[PDB]
Amino acid sequence: DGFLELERSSGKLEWSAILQKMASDLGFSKILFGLLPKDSQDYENAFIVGNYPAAWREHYDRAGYARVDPTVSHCTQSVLPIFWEPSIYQTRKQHEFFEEASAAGLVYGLTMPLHGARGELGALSLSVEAENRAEANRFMESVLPTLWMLKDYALQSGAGLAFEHPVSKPVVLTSREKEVLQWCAIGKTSWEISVICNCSEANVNFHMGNIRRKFGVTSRRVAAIMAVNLGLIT
């Protein structure tokens, strides 16, 4: 059912890139996948990837927002989703937490608690961009069953690659590889690439074949995500 793409993963950030891919194909812009070992409950030094704005992620950890965030509190005692309605922010700090989360563009969304077969505990949060809460919830109920299946697939394949530490060698791209991939990332079709760089269509298909193997992946959309994730393009 298309979810199989995750358990064929080279490692942590091909997997993290496929997760963002499916989450974007559903209609969510920003997502986060957190996971912890079986009975570790210190939310610092956890396995956390996704595409939350890096400024917000670094601030979330330095402020210890894990012990005030109403979503992760919920994941420790329930296995059902929690929606980011204003009702979940009750305390003085939760309001301050909420207003800062919206500044990072995380106004609407939901969090799916994760509980692995071996004791893992984590969260899978997805944020949606809408004009109002009513329009956001009509869409979130539109995709909830698909989303419900996704969180259990992301945790099975995620639990196997999360706590592995195989240091992946660095990846450097040529002068032309980065530019041809830069256009692929913003959805340019391969023929459209040929006419911008004044090369042949096979010239870019050839290049991307080198780009996909330099990252160890099997799809160019996934490789384009890992490039912006590592800051190598754009």
Binding site: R8, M208, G209, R212, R213, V217, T218, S219, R220, R221
Partner: protein
């Protein structure tokens, strides 16, 4: 000394399904291309 036809077969199994019922053309081809470059590169052993 590892089996890497897994990918190729799975990339082909798709590559023959992508047009089984005669959209995802390049995706199925992109899988094949580097699933073949992967084994192809490793097939220079010693």
């Amino acid at each position: 000394l590892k089996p890497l036809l897994d990918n190729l077969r799975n990339a082909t199994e798709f590559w023959n399904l992508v047009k089984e019922a005669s959209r995802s053309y390049r995706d199925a081809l992109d899988w094949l291309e580097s699933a073949a470059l992967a084994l192809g590169d490793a097939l220079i052993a010693q």
